[PDB]
């Protein structure tokens, strides 16, 4: 359970996803790896796009130390991921819009250096701003409950 329960709990509790979301995500992660290496740190994006997603939401975790898992581009080389974006997204167009948005986030190195050291309240405010500032992603549910530091 790399990040899967820690960041899925609020999606289940607030009704964004079905209760067995975490298991479906794990199996799809095995088939479709989530790790991705940026010039800085790894940024991972777990997702499924099934019909068990009730509403669209982004759960973001920051890790104390990197977690080593396979790359999105089909490579066994583990990626030392520090930030994980679990995407509770219902369909294709919405997830591509989010991934395009995440790329803009990934490429903002100054943001990431800060992000690794941001408090939950600060993380919420800067991500919240980026989601709503963007012309895209209207309709995604993002709140303080979806911002978490992952112990170890």
């Amino acid at each position, epitope marked *: 359970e790399d990040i899967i329960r820690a960041l899925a709990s609020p999606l289940i509790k607030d009704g964004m996803v079905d209760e067995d979301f975490a298991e479906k995500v794990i199996e799809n992660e095995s088939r479709y790896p989530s790790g991705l290496q940026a010039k800085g740190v790894g940024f991972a994006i777990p997702h499924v796009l099934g019909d068990y997603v009730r509403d669209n939401a982004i759960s973001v975790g920051i890790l104390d130390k990197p977690v080593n898992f396979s790359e999105w581009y089909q490579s066994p080389d583990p990626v030392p991921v520090r930030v994980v974006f679990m995407l509770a997204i219902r369909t294709w167009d919405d997830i591509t819009n989010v991934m395009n948005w995440i790329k803009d986030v990934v490429l903002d190195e100054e943001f990431m250096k800060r992000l690794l*050291n941001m*408090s*939950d*309240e*600060e993380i919420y*405010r800067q991500i919240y701003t980026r989601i709503s500032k963007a012309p895209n992603l209207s309709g995604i549910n993002f709140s*303080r409950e979806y911002v978490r*530091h992952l112990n170890g």
Partner: antibody
Amino acid sequence: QVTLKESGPGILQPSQTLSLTCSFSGFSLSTFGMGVGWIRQPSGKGLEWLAHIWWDDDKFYNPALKSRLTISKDTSKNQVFLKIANVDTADTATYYCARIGEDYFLDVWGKGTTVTVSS
Amino acid sequence: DIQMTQSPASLSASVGETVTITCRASGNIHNYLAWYQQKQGKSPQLLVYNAKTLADGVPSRFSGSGSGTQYSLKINSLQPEDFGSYYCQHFWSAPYTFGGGTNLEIK
């Protein structure tokens, strides 16, 4: 000019609910990144966190006290309210309303209501 | 919840002397710590925020530094008005609790 003023009861009897109202001023409480909260200081003691309201209506409480209290917002006429149930003599203290700024900023630190509890 | 422990409980210094106050966290609080000071009969004022810089209106005679779990405040040329009760407030993760503070008095 941002400033916080307060009003509440003088003497409360043990087990009664304590109602403290803070008059908020100088900016909107709805302003992004801002909030207000309460800090308690029993005479002769240091400071304790008591309660917190965010611009987005999120709420925090000190877990040691939490089961007895709720905090609420009403932006109509700038009101901040704190309500603590089952207050004991142990809760005699100065209760301060502080302004919170974006990325954490306790500054206004309004004068404290003095609350005492006795028979 | 991460707690702050202050040390020493009390300080004794002459006017014009330099003193330091140390606070350490029960966990890593990165850069979000604030230092406050209380005069008798008044609410405390903000001295230092984001664990390092001075608030507007705050004298240049003092500052602070640190990282991770431990920070300190250093005040040079203490003036009579600088003698009072000091507090460390934790901001990494809410509730925004305080250590118990320290008490600085004139020799």
